[PDB]
Amino acid sequence: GYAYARKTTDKDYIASEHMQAFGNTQLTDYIIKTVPKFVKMAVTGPAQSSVLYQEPTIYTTPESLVPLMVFLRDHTNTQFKCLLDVTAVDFPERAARFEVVYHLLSPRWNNRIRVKVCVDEVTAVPTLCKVFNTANWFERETWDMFGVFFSGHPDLRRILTDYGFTGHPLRKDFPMTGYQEVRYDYGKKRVVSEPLELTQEFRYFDFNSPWETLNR
Amino acid sequence: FEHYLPMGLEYRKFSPGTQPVKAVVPHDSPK
Amino acid sequence: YSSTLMTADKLGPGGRSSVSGITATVFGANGFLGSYIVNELAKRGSQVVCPFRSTENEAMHLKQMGDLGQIVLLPELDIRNDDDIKRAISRSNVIINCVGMRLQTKNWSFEDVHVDFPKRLAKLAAETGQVQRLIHFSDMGADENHKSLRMRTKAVGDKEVLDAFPDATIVRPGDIVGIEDHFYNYLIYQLTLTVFAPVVESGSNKIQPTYVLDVADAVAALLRKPDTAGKTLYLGGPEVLTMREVYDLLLKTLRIYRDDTVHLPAWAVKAMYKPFDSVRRMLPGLPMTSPLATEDYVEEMLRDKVVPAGALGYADLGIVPQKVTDGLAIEPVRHARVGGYRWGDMSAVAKDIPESVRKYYNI
Amino acid sequence: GTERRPGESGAWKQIERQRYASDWENDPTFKRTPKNLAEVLDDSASMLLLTDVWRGMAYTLGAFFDKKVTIMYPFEKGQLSPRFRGEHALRRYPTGEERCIACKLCEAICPAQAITIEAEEREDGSRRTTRYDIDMTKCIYCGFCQEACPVDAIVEGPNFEFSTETREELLYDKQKLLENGDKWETEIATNLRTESLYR
Amino acid sequence: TEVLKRGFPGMKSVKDMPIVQDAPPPGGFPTIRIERRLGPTGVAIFAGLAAIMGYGFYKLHEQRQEK
Amino acid sequence: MIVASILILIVPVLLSVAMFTLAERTVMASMQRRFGPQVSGISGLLQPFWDGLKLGVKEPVLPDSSSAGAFAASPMISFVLSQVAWVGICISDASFQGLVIMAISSLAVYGVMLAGWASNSKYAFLGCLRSVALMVSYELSLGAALLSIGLFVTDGTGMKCLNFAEMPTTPQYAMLPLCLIFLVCILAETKRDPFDLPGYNVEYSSLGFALFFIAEYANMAVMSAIASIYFLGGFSALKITALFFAFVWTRGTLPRYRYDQFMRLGWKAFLPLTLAFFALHASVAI
Amino acid sequence: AKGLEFVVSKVDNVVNWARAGSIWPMTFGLACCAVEMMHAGASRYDLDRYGIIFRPSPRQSDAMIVAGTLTNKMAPALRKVYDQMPEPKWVVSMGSCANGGGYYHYSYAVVRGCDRVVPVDVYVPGCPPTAEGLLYGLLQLQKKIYRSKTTQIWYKK
Amino acid sequence: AKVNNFTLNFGPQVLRLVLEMQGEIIMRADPHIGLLHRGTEKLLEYKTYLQGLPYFDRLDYVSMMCMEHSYVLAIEQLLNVSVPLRGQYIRVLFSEITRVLNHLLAITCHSMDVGALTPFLWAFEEREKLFEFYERVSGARMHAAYFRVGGVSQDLPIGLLRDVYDWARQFASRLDEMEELLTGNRIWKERTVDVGTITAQMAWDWGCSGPILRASGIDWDLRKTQPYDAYGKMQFNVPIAGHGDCYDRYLVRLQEMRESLRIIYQCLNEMPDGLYKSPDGKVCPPSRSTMKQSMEALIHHFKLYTEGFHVPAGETYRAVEAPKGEFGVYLVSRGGNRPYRCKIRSPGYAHLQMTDVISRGAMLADVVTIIGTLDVVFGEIDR
Numbered sequence A: 001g002y003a004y005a006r007k008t009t010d011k012d013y014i015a016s017e018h019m020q021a022f023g024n025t026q027l028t029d030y031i032i033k034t035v036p037k038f039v040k041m042a043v044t045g046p047a048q049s050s051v052l053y054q055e056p057t058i059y060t061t062p063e064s065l066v067p068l069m070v071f072l073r074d075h076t077n078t079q080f081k082c083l084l085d086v087t088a089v090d091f092p093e094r095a096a097r098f099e100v101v102y103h104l105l106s107p108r109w110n111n112r113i114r115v116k117v118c119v120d121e122v123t124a125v126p127t128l129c130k131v132f133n134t135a136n137w138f139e140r141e142t143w144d145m146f147g148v149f150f151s152g153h154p155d156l157r158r159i160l161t162d163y164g165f166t167g168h169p170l171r172k173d174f175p176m177t178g179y180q181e182v183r184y185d186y187g188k189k190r191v192v193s194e195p196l197e198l199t200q201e202f203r204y205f206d207f208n209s210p211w212e213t214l215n216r
Numbered sequence B: 001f002e003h004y005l006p007m008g009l010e011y012r013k014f015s016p017g018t019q020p021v022k023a024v025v026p027h028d029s030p031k
Numbered sequence C: 001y002s003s004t005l006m007t008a009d010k011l012g013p014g015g016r017s018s019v020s021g022i023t024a025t026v027f028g029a030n031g032f033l034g035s036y037i038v039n040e041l042a043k044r045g046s047q048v049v050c051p052f053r054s055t056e057n058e059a060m061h062l063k064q065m066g067d068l069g070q071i072v073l074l075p076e077l078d079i080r081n082d083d084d085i086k087r088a089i090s091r092s093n094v095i096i097n098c099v100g101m102r103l104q105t106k107n108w109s110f111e112d113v114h115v116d117f118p119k120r121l122a123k124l125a126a127e128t129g130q131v132q133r134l135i136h137f138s139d140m141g142a143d144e145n146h147k148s149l150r151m152r153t154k155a156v157g158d159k160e161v162l163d164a165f166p167d168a169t170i171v172r173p174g175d176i177v178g179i180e181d182h183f184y185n186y187l188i189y190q191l192t193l194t195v196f197a198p199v200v201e202s203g204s205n206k207i208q209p210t211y212v213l214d215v216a217d218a219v220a221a222l223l224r225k226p227d228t229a230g231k232t233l234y235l236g237g238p239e240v241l242t243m244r245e246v247y248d249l250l251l252k253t254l255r256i257y258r259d260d261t262v263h264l265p266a267w268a269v270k271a272m273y274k275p276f277d278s279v280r281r282m283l284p285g286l287p288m289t290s291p292l293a294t295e296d297y298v299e300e301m302l303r304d305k306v307v308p309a310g311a312l313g314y315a316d317l318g319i320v321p322q323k324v325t326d327g328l329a330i331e332p333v334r335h336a337r338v339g340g341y342r343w344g345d346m347s348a349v350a351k352d353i354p355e356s357v358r359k360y361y362n363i
Numbered sequence D: 001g002t003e004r005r006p007g008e009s010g011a012w013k014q015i016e017r018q019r020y021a022s023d024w025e026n027d028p029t030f031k032r033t034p035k036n037l038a039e040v041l042d043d044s045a046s047m048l049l050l051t052d053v054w055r056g057m058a059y060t061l062g063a064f065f066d067k068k069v070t071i072m073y074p075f076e077k078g079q080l081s082p083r084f085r086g087e088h089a090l091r092r093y094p095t096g097e098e099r100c101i102a103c104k105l106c107e108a109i110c111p112a113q114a115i116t117i118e119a120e121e122r123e124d125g126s127r128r129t130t131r132y133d134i135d136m137t138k139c140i141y142c143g144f145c146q147e148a149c150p151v152d153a154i155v156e157g158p159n160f161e162f163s164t165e166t167r168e169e170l171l172y173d174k175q176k177l178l179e180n181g182d183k184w185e186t187e188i189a190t191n192l193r194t195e196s197l198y199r
Numbered sequence E: 001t002e003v004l005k006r007g008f009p010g011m012k013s014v015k016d017m018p019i020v021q022d023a024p025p026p027g028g029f030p031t032i033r034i035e036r037r038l039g040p041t042g043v044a045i046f047a048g049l050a051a052i053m054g055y056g057f058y059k060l061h062e063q064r065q066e067k
Numbered sequence F: 001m002i003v004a005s006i007l008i009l010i011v012p013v014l015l016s017v018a019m020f021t022l023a024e025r026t027v028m029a030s031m032q033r034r035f036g037p038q039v040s041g042i043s044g045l046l047q048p049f050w051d052g053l054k055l056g057v058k059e060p061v062l063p064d065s066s067s068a069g070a071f072a073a074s075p076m077i078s079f080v081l082s083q084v085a086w087v088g089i090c091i092s093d094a095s096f097q098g099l100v101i102m103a104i105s106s107l108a109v110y111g112v113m114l115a116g117w118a119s120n121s122k123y124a125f126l127g128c129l130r131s132v133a134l135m136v137s138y139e140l141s142l143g144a145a146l147l148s149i150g151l152f153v154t155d156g157t158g159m160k161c162l163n164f165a166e167m168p169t170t171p172q173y174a175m176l177p178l179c180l181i182f183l184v185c186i187l188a189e190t191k192r193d194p195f196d197l198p199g200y201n202v203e204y205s206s207l208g209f210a211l212f213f214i215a216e217y218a219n220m221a222v223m224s225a226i227a228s229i230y231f232l233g234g235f236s237a238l239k240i241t242a243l244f245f246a247f248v249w250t251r252g253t254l255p256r257y258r259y260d261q262f263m264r265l266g267w268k269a270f271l272p273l274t275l276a277f278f279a280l281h282a283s284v285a286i
Numbered sequence G: 001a002k003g004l005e006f007v008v009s010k011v012d013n014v015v016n017w018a019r020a021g022s023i024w025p026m027t028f029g030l031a032c033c034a035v036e037m038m039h040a041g042a043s044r045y046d047l048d049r050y051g052i053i054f055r056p057s058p059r060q061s062d063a064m065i066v067a068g069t070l071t072n073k074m075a076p077a078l079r080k081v082y083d084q085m086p087e088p089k090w091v092v093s094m095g096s097c098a099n100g101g102g103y104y105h106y107s108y109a110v111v112r113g114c115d116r117v118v119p120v121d122v123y124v125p126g127c128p129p130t131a132e133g134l135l136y137g138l139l140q141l142q143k144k145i146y147r148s149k150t151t152q153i154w155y156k157k
Numbered sequence H: 001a002k003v004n005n006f007t008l009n010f011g012p013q014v015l016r017l018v019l020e021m022q023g024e025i026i027m028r029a030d031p032h033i034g035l036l037h038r039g040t041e042k043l044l045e046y047k048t049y050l051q052g053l054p055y056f057d058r059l060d061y062v063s064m065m066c067m068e069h070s071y072v073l074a075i076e077q078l079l080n081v082s083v084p085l086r087g088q089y090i091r092v093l094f095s096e097i098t099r100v101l102n103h104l105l106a107i108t109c110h111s112m113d114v115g116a117l118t119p120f121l122w123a124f125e126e127r128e129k130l131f132e133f134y135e136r137v138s139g140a141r142m143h144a145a146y147f148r149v150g151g152v153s154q155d156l157p158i159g160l161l162r163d164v165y166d167w168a169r170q171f172a173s174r175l176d177e178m179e180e181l182l183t184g185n186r187i188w189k190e191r192t193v194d195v196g197t198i199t200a201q202m203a204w205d206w207g208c209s210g211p212i213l214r215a216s217g218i219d220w221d222l223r224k225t226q227p228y229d230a231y232g233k234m235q236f237n238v239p240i241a242g243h244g245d246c247y248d249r250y251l252v253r254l255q256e257m258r259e260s261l262r263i264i265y266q267c268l269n270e271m272p273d274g275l276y277k278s279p280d281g282k283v284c285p286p287s288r289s290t291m292k293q294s295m296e297a298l299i300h301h302f303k304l305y306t307e308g309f310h311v312p313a314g315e316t317y318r319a320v321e322a323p324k325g326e327f328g329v330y331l332v333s334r335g336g337n338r339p340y341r342c343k344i345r346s347p348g349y350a351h352l353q354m355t356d357v358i359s360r361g362a363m364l365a366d367v368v369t370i371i372g373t374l375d376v377v378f379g380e381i382d383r
């Protein structure tokens, strides 16, 4: 619990020079050297905190996500107390198609960091409910949207979709309009789910230029 | 104490379709 | 004509956005049976035209039943005017008649509704040339030699319809059960809300009640099969019951522990119902008047109303009719029992139910 | 005032805490104990005899005798601007020829996919639409179609009072949109004479 | 192209193009209030209440004797 | 002549209830810088009548899981008690008239509790007990206030009574705090602001609902007349209008209490104050 | 006959004056469009001036205003609350989302129009409609109520 | 004794709550959400970057342009686009107008849920004035679609700053007459003081942001610690309270309205002349006169309104101090003209997760106060 109101005057500054220099330049190398077995890959890129800086991205295994997050929360130089979100990105071309992404914020030194774990559809990721209390609903949403199972969760159940909803909508192979639709039936006197029919089907416009160089 | 509801011509004296001075908007830099 | 009605214009697999090729006009579409028929046609992608006499509030429930443009609503229908009937059927290859009456009024008699209008409708249907099917609804107890006036006028109108439109189908179902019916609802209003319920004689006359969804399926099965044109079908459920058995079933289902019915001779019942039948004319029609408080009902109770031997029924349409005494059909009358429907103690089976469920239901 | 009291505390843990310990006297946002007779009378005239309810009552009684902000619709209207995005409409040249040339840019930019266009060449060789539909129940009224149009053919006019009784009345085809433009042309031109200085 | 839009007859340089936009008046707008701006002594309130109640009690005594 | 007098009383009670509910809407609107009902008739003067006629042709919902007799009986009991209390105000000469009206208003609890028992809603049963607890809690302060009032009510022959015609025609200046407690007790009985948290008529439609609201506004008028008789030196039309305006004015400007908050208020503030004032007035009256 | 038919027509006139001047709607504030409905009830437009009182329970409600998008998870609840209102009742669909799905029309989770669940009397267009446009739609609903003739239809049955 | 919990269902009519009580005291609260989940994160993958922008107006529909801001900033960072000075000033000015609108609605809806009806009707006329300010620059009262990549959509019309100054000249009086009904009132205090207390450790552990975080004694404002556009030039104060109360959050929100008024006044006097859009024609569409007179502008107009710009491959997370807290967008780019993945982080989602630990030990009549003081809108909660 940090960033208590201490100065009673208006502050015209953000951070100190030495700690901002350390966070913006040396934090990647520091995390790699202190805990090398936790880190498998690092990217230093365009800085979640501001447009003017650079900030690290740490790749880790699921077997060491919890100790790395505990280290990043409690170490005296990396005090990442706030977990902003947990989400996933689907990459169907990979052997492990999911990347679970964790964003963190350090109120002590005005920093941010990103932590990634790569898993497929049937490999569980350890929960961070004991480390961060917001990890509960975000892991529930990630299970709902992508089908990533978080082991050790207290109550992993769907939170966003419909009550009988099977299927994970944010996967790339799930259709945009889905498989079922809903209407009221006068004969059965109930709201009933039926297979999808569209009065006007969705028109897909393929705009992409055959001279464009940026497509990756 | 400033009063809510100003009276006539003390607020929005001209409608936006009857702007009293013509507008010249820059859309490119001279450089 | 034969089976080109159901095949030639059929587009899509058959849902709400599909096209069946049927343009149908349903007369009496806001009624009890007509609403279910209009729902049955429109859900498969048919255009349904619905003229009505009542206010728009009583017809608004038909607007939901189909996709955009496929439910057509024509208010201020006057069936003594041929222009309204001509406009309502001007694009339809199917006409379905559900217009009927149960009590007489100073503005409308049984012949006006069961005879004159079906005759003029069949004539105007045969004039167009594009109407391939005319489904007319009558009663199972319809007979020209019936003492009840409504059964006799119904049979006379059936004859006029088969005369003017030779391929028109005549449908004669039994008593129809449903949420908004006129059979269990008036019987429950007779078991409760009255000091006593009169039963005509011993109550040993036999009936064959049927479910409303089965009749709605029967209309679509008739429209499929070309052989059923010009025929007469009797629609009755899989069980033959007496009126005493029906009263006993309702008293057991309602959980009423006092039989308030009394068996009376037919002259006594007619003497009771006579003062409110000589004054039925010169009156515009009163609310909450039972259709069982007439001499015609007493004459119907002195006869059997069942499917005749050798007649065409549900089995010729490929339909196994649902049971009326138990199941989904009897669920609405189970809601009117004393205290409420309710589940029970729910504790014998909650033994090996998981943790959060029992606390959720406070068991 | 924003001051606190032991007793006015809304919860139970703080109510139990204030009556068994004097930790509330260290907190600077609390009102201190009265020290003499006159302060006790001021505190009692605060708690009894209200006087904090009365200030709000005096304010609401002043508002009872004040001016009102209600307009008498539909005899009086609100205030809008020439940029207002209302009912879509199709426009003509002063000669009477359609401005639209079936480029399908407004159909491409539409995030709701509320536009459906078909075209072929007219008998005089001109490039014109044969179908131009706007589903007004799919439209989001963003104005992106108005921005994408290079000939000022499709606009969002100044009409907002177009509620109907059937939903089929809100699936506009090309003829109705041209009828809307023929209705609203002078107002649309007056609006565009100002908004062309900015766009 | 911008010269076609904003330029005037006889303009010598591209730096001479006029600009007329929404602007504050010369000197700016005047200053405004931002922060919150704000009874009788309880002795006075209690004295007035005691006076009214004492008059009431005197009238009660008088009407009791008359009754 | 008694039937004629009672019907001639009943006519302005219902006319006044319609005009009270309109005046509440319009005064509440004027405090909020708007207009309130103006369209429905000239100056909105037909709005309560069209509300009543709209509810007249509205469908009566009779739930087929409740007991129909108690469900019908609850708003009838409320309406009958309000009309009887008005008759006790104006067509009585009894010696203990204030005690009669206190007894009638103690009977008014039954409509709330019959509505709570009849309708099969989960939270109607939850809210009826809270509303009954509020009314029951403030009835005792009303009774102790009546005790303080009756210590000084004597007729010409020397007999002490609660007859309304024997009350003095001057305001009771000696009992200003008791008058304020009486007014807040009236606010608590009618479930108005700031005690409007508990509703019990969630299952009622059409004229049963209309009977509920006519009973509520008529009871408010009864309590206003009672307060004007006890403290303001008489019953008058101007005093009825002024006290109603005061109640709407309080409803415009205040938020409401929690359940335990007004329970603590009624059982730790108002009852000891009324009892202490009774002891002081008994000491004065010797 | 002429006199009694004249009386019956005047009974319809008075009943329609009462029903249109006493519409008590029920709020489904599902989404964006609810804020404009709040602005319609506020002091500038003053829905209470036209006799409109918002009611919490469906038993006292005369109309339903669907103001916002309807999802597959919310559709049976909306249908159940609609079924609990007593007759006569009307439904006002407000905004593109309730009208036809709107910007979420091709989603896996949205009902494409509240027409698909409940029948609708007056459709108000916009995303959102202005509060003044909602006033126009409600005045149109009043016009629909004025053309009803219930006792004249009953008299000729 | 062995007292089982009594459970309660709280409202289908779009928050659903399943409470547990041990009498009059709540032991558990479980919110059930997803009744407004329309799948906007899936639908954004099927839109171009300009096409998907009006989805963000419909997330927090009380505060629209602030939702637009973070999506625009996330695109601009990956594109390496600079915004001109006048556009930055316009963005700051309309962001603060948006914050004033949101705080007016939040405080008055809270006080109406508690029982005070008049402040709602008083504040909504001021909301109508600020809606007229939205409409005069974008043509929409709510869903403006005003902020674009590289600047704003249109210039300010002549005569807007004059009227914004005339509104700001009397807004402090409106906030003053608002506080006379609530701040020194004992019923409001007895409803709000010490209800739903949040300490600093619980605030950071439960991912809190915005005026909740400032009422627990934490000096954290994103407009002062990680500034964006011209917020570093703005001079204003951060209000701080220290109880974590409903009452303290109410006071912090009122002071934040005062500070937003201060920033609005500063923006009205320092508004510069110049470009309001970035001059990169391969990202920003040209003017309508330029498009009708030069070939390159017409080509760029055609391509930017059909295919759209291509964002280079990469990722970013960008956040904005939205009036309910930190609103952030996680944008994943593969290189196309469509977002590969667009995760939306909403503060009300994290604030509503706390209702199980905040309502413990409270009564049924305090649940609505807790829900009102968390300042939740279910469009951004249920994406």
Ligand SMILES: NC(=O)C1=CN([C@@H]2O[C@H](COP(=O)(O)OP(=O)(O)OC[C@H]3O[C@@H](n4cnc5c(N)ncnc54)[C@H](OP(=O)(O)O)[C@@H]3O)[C@@H](O)[C@H]2O)C=CC1
Binding pocket: C027, C028, C029, C030, C031, C032, C033, C034, C052, C053, C054, C077, C079, C097, C098, C099, C100, C101, C108, C113, C137, C138, C139, C140, C172, C173, C174, C175, C176, C177, C182, C183
């Ligand atoms: N069990 C049963 O109910 C059986 C029914 N049938 C037949 O099936 C048909 C459907 O019956 P059901 O729906 O139960 O009865 P309903 O009364 O529900 O349906 C009758 C319909 O006909 C309309 N109608 C009646 N008279 C006239 C008239 N003079 N002019 C215009 N329209 C009129 C009514 O409209 P409005 O609402 O305006 O009155 C109503 O919609 C009936 O014709 C009946 O003869 C046959 C055997 C058994």
Ligand SMILES: COC1=C(OC)C(=O)C(C/C=C(\C)CC/C=C(\C)CC/C=C(\C)CC/C=C(\C)CCC=C(C)C)=C(C)C1=O
Binding pocket: F014, F015, F017, F018, F021, F022, F024, F025, F047, F048, F049, F051, F052, F210, F213, F214, G053
């Ligand atoms: C915010 O507060 C409010 C509410 O919420 C608590 C409300 O619910 C209502 C609406 C409810 C109303 C008005 C119902 C209660 C009143 C009724 C039924 C009026 C009673 C009037 C009568 C009996 C006289 C009218 C009858 C006549 C003139 C007879 C006509 C006869 C002939 C023409 C032959 C209002 C106005 C209100 O403000």
Ligand code: SF4
Binding pocket: D088, D109, D110, D111, D112, D113, D114, D115, D134, D138, D139, D140, D141, D142, D143, D144, D145, D146, D156
């Ligand atoms: S305004 Fe928006 S929704 Fe309407 S047609 Fe144009 S682009 Fe489509």
Ligand code: SF4
Binding pocket: D099, D100, D101, D102, D103, D104, D105, D106, D107, D117, D148, D149, D150, D151, D152, D153, D154
């Ligand atoms: S309206 Fe304009 S943008 Fe749309 S097709 Fe016609 S010319 Fe092209």
Ligand code: SF4
Binding pocket: G031, G032, G033, G034, G067, G068, G069, G094, G095, G096, G097, G098, G102, G103, G126, G127, G128, G129, H058, H061
């Ligand atoms: S129609 Fe538009 S404004 Fe209304 S709820 Fe839907 S998205 Fe929001």
